[PDB]
Amino acid sequence: FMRFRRAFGEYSHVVAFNTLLFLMSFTVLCLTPVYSFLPGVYSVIYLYLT
Amino acid sequence: WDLTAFGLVAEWFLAYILFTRFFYVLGLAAIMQLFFSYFAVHFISNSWLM
Amino acid sequence: FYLTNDVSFLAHIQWMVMFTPLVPFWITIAYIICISTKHFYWFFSNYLKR
């Protein structure tokens, strides 16, 4: 567990940032059944921000 | 067989045997919970505090 | 802003309890953003920045 804790810090910078993106994607997926145009524009803005 | 209801009835009976000044506030909470669960919906609107 | 944190917390709690149900939403969101920027800066610096 100590070795894993020491190793985790290298990828922590990506792991922390992944959470906000996952939350935004989940929110967009949840909002899909009402606004059935969101998955299109959201893909474009996602690629733009990438 | 199942006897959860009998156990709850026994608990309530033993609580009534050990009568104190604070049994009334618990009975009020129970009856309010029952009332809210029974009707609900009708008189809840706006007022996030409510 | 011109108050100690000890009374500032109570003032914020009282303002959020009392004035919330009769104020426009954008005022509340601006209040939340202005209160939480001081912690957003720290969080971004310590867990997201590069």
Add this chain to the structure above:
Amino acid sequence: FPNTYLEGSVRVVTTFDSEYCRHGTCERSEAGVCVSTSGRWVLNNDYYRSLPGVFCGVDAVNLLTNMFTPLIQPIGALDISASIVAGGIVAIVVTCLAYY
């Protein structure tokens, strides 16, 4: 049935003042223009201007102005879509203040 300006996933309907009806039930609808983000049925009558994804207004400009009506509504009107509405104000406020 009323005239339809567009058909498909996005539907735009303009109606007069008449009891428009089809196979099923009938209701009276006021004259105006209605637009919905889904292909569901839309009317200017009451109980129709409450459902999510349905927009309505007296005219084209009136509908566009009324599209922002929930934004001046007191907090406690949206449940799931509150996040995007909050973000759309937070981004504008933070930019317009912190830069300009």
